Amino acid sequence: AGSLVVLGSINADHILNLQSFPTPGETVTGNHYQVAFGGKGANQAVAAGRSGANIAFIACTGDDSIGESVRQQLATDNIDITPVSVIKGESTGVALIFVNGEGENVIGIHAGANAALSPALVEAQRERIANASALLMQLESPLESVMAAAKIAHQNKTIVALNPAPARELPDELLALVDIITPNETEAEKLTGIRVENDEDAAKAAQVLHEKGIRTVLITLGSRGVWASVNGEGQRVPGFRVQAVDTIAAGDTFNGALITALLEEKPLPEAIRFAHAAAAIAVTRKGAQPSVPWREEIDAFLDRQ
Amino acid sequence: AGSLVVLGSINADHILNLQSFPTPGETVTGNHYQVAFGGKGANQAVAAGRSGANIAFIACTGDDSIGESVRQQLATDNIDITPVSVIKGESTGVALIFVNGEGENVIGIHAGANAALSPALVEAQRERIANASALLMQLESPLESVMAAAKIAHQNKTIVALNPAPARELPDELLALVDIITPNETEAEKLTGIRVENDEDAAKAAQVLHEKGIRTVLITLGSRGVWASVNGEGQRVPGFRVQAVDTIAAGDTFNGALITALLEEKPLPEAIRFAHAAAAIAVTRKGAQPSVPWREEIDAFLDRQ
Ligand SMILES: OC[C@H]1O[C@H](O)[C@H](O)[C@@H]1O
Ligand SMILES: OC[C@H]1O[C@H](O)[C@H](O)[C@@H]1O
């Protein structure tokens, strides 16, 4: 399997379980409270590394205590943490999260040191990006830096995979550089104009992304699995019906695991299956990163399926 | 002015400013992020102490670093922190807060060590409560402990003031022990059954609380000020139209400042005016506790009014 470069955020997640999300001006008393490692970059890097990829992670942490001890934690998840830089005089990105009784979540992030991952730090990782087979990125890092890395990857034939989350509009210059894009429906709407309630809407939205230059488009459809479209021809690949308890890092786990299977030369339908299996384990557990499965558990899940 | 005993929560507030509250399953990027001292007990204790009361505070902190340094901070706000206990092996209550662009907030709390403020710790403060002129409490402390303290106060003729927040139903045994109650409209609905959209609804709701044994009922009506009802006869006392930016601790500041004026023998209408002035300063500033005004600023605000 070739090498994977993940580039994205690292956060300290502050998670509170409650019955129901507080409404404006209301104070709710929750139950469980947890401070754990998260971030869309870290979560995908962990999911890639635990499922078996040969992955290196480009990220910025602050020099607080949490920043200084997340690198050590990430190194045990089978991730080369050499390109994780420690920004002096800055704190680690933070996430404040509410997880309700039905298991949905609401998330508010504060960039912190994730904002210091710049085009200069990306430009120092040119060779790593150039030699990699894939580059996986999200939108919790500065847009300039996602654009700079996509550019180096594009020149050097490194697959560029982008999980466009959280939702935002992206300029065509970035979109043209992407090979694999994995939006959810809110995100596919925000990038193309097309609301996505079904497979016809999904095929509509995918065609706009094919129009922008993106060959492989995967639109996740919540409980309905994913709309997989490779330059036009597209179909639905359902996930595993499972008992959701904590749906945080489900998307992240799917993206990291997805790229691992593709770097092991698994056809796309099979890479999606494998990723769906990692996500299905992840959501039956709590917290972002802690719910991420190792390769032997993904296999076992698949063997019984 | 006689002595005030405040009994209630101490929290570490984790506050993120954002445009708009995240909706289910959506991740939002906020701007400012702050970790500060809060808790309905601490906020009211600070508002009482800074505005001039002779106040002592019964509360439990954990032995984390934040717990160990909030006592020292509270001692500078003119508060006797002797009855603030440090619970070994426990963390300080936490609050996770979103503050939107219009300045409203959504709050989710985790009890922590606030749950260890028990009837035994209350029973050890019997003499302090018995000798005080007023006892101010909220609902972020165990209901048993609010009930135990109300009982000692009632026996010894200490005014019992209760800010029934966050909203919950209360048993008649507690209600019968209260002299002054300060619900907001959600809270007045939850205690009596009566939704409160206006002064007629407010007078309806107040009559139920008068029915339960509570002589002085103050129903805050958001921007419309407060419905003041002393055993029936009731009227509206408007607040100061001001430019809200951070409405957190506005209620708390009003309650603490309210009790200070009453302990200085100011008639109720005038105590409300003074409290309204402390709240009006508080909301033009950010964070719970940090936005709380000192006595000279309340006076100055009143002098120009
Ligand atoms: O995607 C899950 C992650 O999004 C936010 O970035 C949180 O930090 C959380 O860990
Ligand atoms: O009332 C304001 C307070 O309520 C919650 O208890 C937060 O900690 C905040 O400081």
Q: Do B27 and A98 touch (CB under 8 A)?
A: no
- Which residue of B15, B92, B106, B220 is the best one to mutate when testing the A interface, meaning the one whose CB has the most A CBs within 10 A? B106
Q: Tell me, in angstroms, the distance from the centre of ligand 2 to residue A36's CA.
A: 23
Which two structure tokens, joined as six digits, stand for A293?
Answer: 């499965």
Which two structure tokens, joined as six digits, stand for B259?
Answer: 């009790």
CA atoms within 13 A on the CB side of B68: 6
Long-range contact pairs involving B291-298 (C-beta distance under 8 Å, separation at least 24)? B291/B246, B291/B248, B291/B249, B291/B253, B292/B43, B292/B46, B292/B47, B292/B50, B292/B77, B292/B249, B292/B253, B292/B256, B293/B47, B293/B50, B293/B51, B293/B253, B294/B50, B294/B51, B295/B50, B295/B51, B295/B52, B298/B51, B298/B257, B298/B274
Find the Cα–Cα–Cα–Cα dihedral B97, B99, B104, B107, rounded to 10°. Answer: -10
Strands B234-237 and A180-181: unpaired
Contact A136, A44 (CB under 8 A): yes
Number of Cβ within a 10 Å radius of residue A94: 26
Q: How far is CA A118 from CA A141, A147, B64, in A?
A: 8, 10, 35
Q: Do A22 and B94 touch (CB under 8 A)?
A: no
Using the 8-state DSSP alphabet, how is residue B283 labeled?
T
Tell whether B169 lies on the interface with A, counting CB pairs under 8 A.
Answer: no
Q: Tell me which residues of A are annotated as active site.
A: 252
Alpha carbon B227 to chain centroid, angstroms: 17
Rounded CA-CA distance A264/A274 in Å is 11
Q: Where are the alpha helices (DSSP H) in A240-303?
A: 250-263, 268-282, 295-303
Q: In sequence order, which residues have a C-beta less than 8 Å from that of residue A249 and are 6 or more positions away?
A: A38, A43, A47, A282, A287, A288, A289, A291, A292
Cis peptide before B171 (omega within 30 of 0): no
Rounded CA-CA distance A61/A87 in Å is 6
Query: Phi and psi at residue A132, in whole multiples of 5°?
Result: -85, 165
Which two structure tokens, joined as six digits, stand for B207?
Answer: 């009559």
Q: How far is CA A289 from CA A39, B36, B166, in A?
A: 9, 27, 32
Rounded CA-CA distance B284/B242 in Å is 8
| DSSP secondary structure letters along B44-76 | HHHHHHHHT-EEEEEEEEESSHHHHHHHHHHHT
Using the 8-state DSSP alphabet, how is residue A290 labeled?
G
Top mutation candidate among A35, A140, A283, A286 for ligand 1, by most atoms within 8 Å of CB: A140
Contact B295, B282 (CB under 8 A): no
SS3 B159: strand
Contact B138, B181 (CB under 8 A): no
Q: Tell me, in angstroms, the distance from the centre of ligand 2 to residue A101's CA.
A: 22
Query: Phi and psi at residue B288, in whole multiples of 5°?
Result: -70, -90
Q: Tell me which residues of B are annotated as active site.
A: 252
Q: Which residues of B120-155 are buried (b: 16+ CB within 10 A; e: fewer)?
A: ebbeebeebbeebbbbbbbbbbbeebbbbbbbbbbe
Max CA separation in chain B (angstroms): 52
Strands B105-110 and B93-99: antiparallel
Q: Which residues in chain A have their CB less than 8 angstroms from residue B106's CB?
A: 21-26
Strands A226-230 and A216-220: antiparallel
> Which helix (H) or strand (E) covers residue B197, if one does?
none
Tell whether B152 lies on the interface with A, counting CB pairs under 8 A.
Answer: no
Rounded CA-CA distance A254/A43 in Å is 10
Q: Residue with structure tokens 């390769």?
A: A295
Rounded CA-CA distance A9/A2 in Å is 23
In chain B, the residue whose alpha carbon lies closest to the alpha carbon of A107 is: B27
Query: Phi and psi at residue A10, in whole multiples of 5°?
Result: -130, 125
The experimental technique used to determine this model is: X-ray
Final resolution, Å: 2.4
SS3 A113: helix
Q: Residue with structure tokens 């870290």?
A: A42
CA angle A61, A100, A106 (to 5 degrees): 45
Q: Tell me, in angstroms, the distance from the centre of ligand 2 to residue A143's CA.
A: 35
Using the 8-state DSSP alphabet, how is residue B291 labeled?
G
Using the 8-state DSSP alphabet, how is residue B172 labeled?
H
Q: Which residues in chain B have their CB less than 8 angstroms from residue A109's CB?
A: 27-30
> What is the identity of the amino acid at B239?
G
CATH class of B1-305: alpha beta
Number of Cβ within a 10 Å radius of residue B200: 9
In chain B, the residue whose alpha carbon lies closest to the alpha carbon of A40 is: B27
Name the β-bridge partners of A14: A35, A96
Tell whether A283 lies on the interface with B, counting CB pairs under 8 A.
Answer: no
